[PDB]
Design a binder for this molecule. Structure first.
Ligand code: HEM
Ligand SMILES: [Ca+2]
Ligand SMILES: [Ca+2]
Ligand SMILES: [Zn+2]
Ligand SMILES: [Zn+2]
Ligand SMILES: [Zn+2]
Length: 318
């Protein structure tokens, strides 16, 4: 189909998204960059969607975190989500899209700005949310592997899918874990969707980048990077370590698995058969820049190998 402005899409119902795309690329993502607001919007997709429990309730990827912001933005795990919720709200108000659709659309558009990134499948038509998420459904960095895997499993994700989703931490920073060093990334390339996160989390810790006693934080290998306890554990625990290492220098796998698992996440609480496929509105991401490496000065002996079956691959240092 051909939209009013000449841009094309497989389904004409998707044409409504083109002005939304343009508006967010300029006014949410600073001119289509893979920066702060992309990182925050990607986190928001998860905090919206993971509010889904057969036992406890919540409608998943339903926009509840916006619609019921007064409740959800006060949950402790939603610390520091409230800025991006406030930023997204006016776009929802001005564009006649449900909040659930908008959150997933913005997340997919944002990821597509990141070199190495993917075009996450995007479906249009989620109804407005009808309940707030319960509290305590978002994993915390001080939660154990067993707790995290049980929570994610409750929502429908296998252990390997949790690892795949954590490729998000390749384009990510922390503002609240250590509030003395806001904006500190989880890998050395927070503007590049790459395997550096899976490499750098496997390194021996060396230092605390800010203060030395924050809940849910462990030592980082690098000044200017922060390491979550949860990521530290997931990289090393026997239940997940082999899958974690399999992501290292495996860009095609990171791409394929992140896109597919994000689509699953974006559809929690929804039925794809009642939605319209608008995947081709999402921009084409740039190719990866750079290549998997150890940080400058590091060597393979700095890697804490945790997969008994398969040795860590022989990366070189910058
Ligand atoms: C599996 C358990 C997970 C835990 C324990 C966890 C924990 C965290 C924490 C503590 C932060 C930093 C918040 C702050 O202090 O500002 C963070 C940031 C982030 N998380 Fe995760 N996360 C998990 C899974 C995910 C998943 C599945 C996604 C997928 C979308 C995701 C995407 C992000 C992104 C993109 C950021 C960066 C936000 C920014 O730059 O402000 N996380 N996460
Ligand atoms: Ca929700
Ligand atoms: Ca990265
Ligand atoms: Zn900005
Ligand atoms: Zn911010
Ligand atoms: Zn374990």
């Amino acid at each position: 189909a051909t939209c009013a402005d000449g841009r094309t899409t497989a389904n004409a119902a998707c044409c409504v998204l083109f002005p939304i795309l343009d508006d967010i690329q300029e006014n949410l993502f600073d001119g289509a960059q893979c920066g702060e607001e992309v990182h925050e919007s990607l986190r928001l997709t998860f905090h919206d969607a993971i509010g889904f429990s057969p036992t406890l309730g919540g409608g998943g990827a339903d926009g509840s975190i916006i619609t019921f912001d007064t409740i959800e933005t006060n949950f402790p795990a939603n610390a520091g989500i409230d800025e991006i919720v406030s930023a997204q709200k006016p776009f929802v108000a001005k564009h006649n899209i449900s909040a659930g659709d908008f959150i997933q659309f913005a997340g997919a558009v944002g990821v597509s700005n990141c070199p190495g990134g993917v075009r996450i499948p995007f479906f249009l038509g989620r109804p407005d949310a009808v309940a707030a998420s319960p509290d305590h459904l978002v994993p915390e960095p001080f939660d154990s592997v067993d707790t995290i895997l049980a929570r994610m499993g409750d929502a429908g994700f296998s252990a390997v899918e949790v690892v795949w989703l954590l490729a998000s931490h390749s384009i990510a920073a922390a503002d609240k874990v250590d509030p003395s060093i806001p904006g500190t990334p989880f890998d050395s390339t927070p503007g590049v969707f790459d395997s550096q996160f899976f490499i750098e989390t496997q390194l021996k810790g060396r230092l605390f980048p800010g203060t030395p006693d924050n809940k849910g934080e462990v030592q980082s290998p690098l000044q200017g990077e922060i390491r979550l306890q949860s990521d530290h554990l997931l990289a090393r625990d026997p239940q997940t370590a082999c899958e974690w290492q399999s992501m290292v220098n495996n860009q095609p796998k990171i791409q394929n698995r992140f896109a597919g698992t994000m689509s699953k996440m974006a559809l929690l609480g929804q039925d794809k058969s009642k939605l319209i496929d608008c995947s081709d509105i999402i921009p084409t991401p740039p190719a990866l820049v750079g290549a998997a490496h150890l940080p400058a000065g590091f060597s393979l002996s700095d890697v804490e190998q945790a997969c008994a079956e398969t040795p860590f691959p022989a990366l070189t240092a910058d």
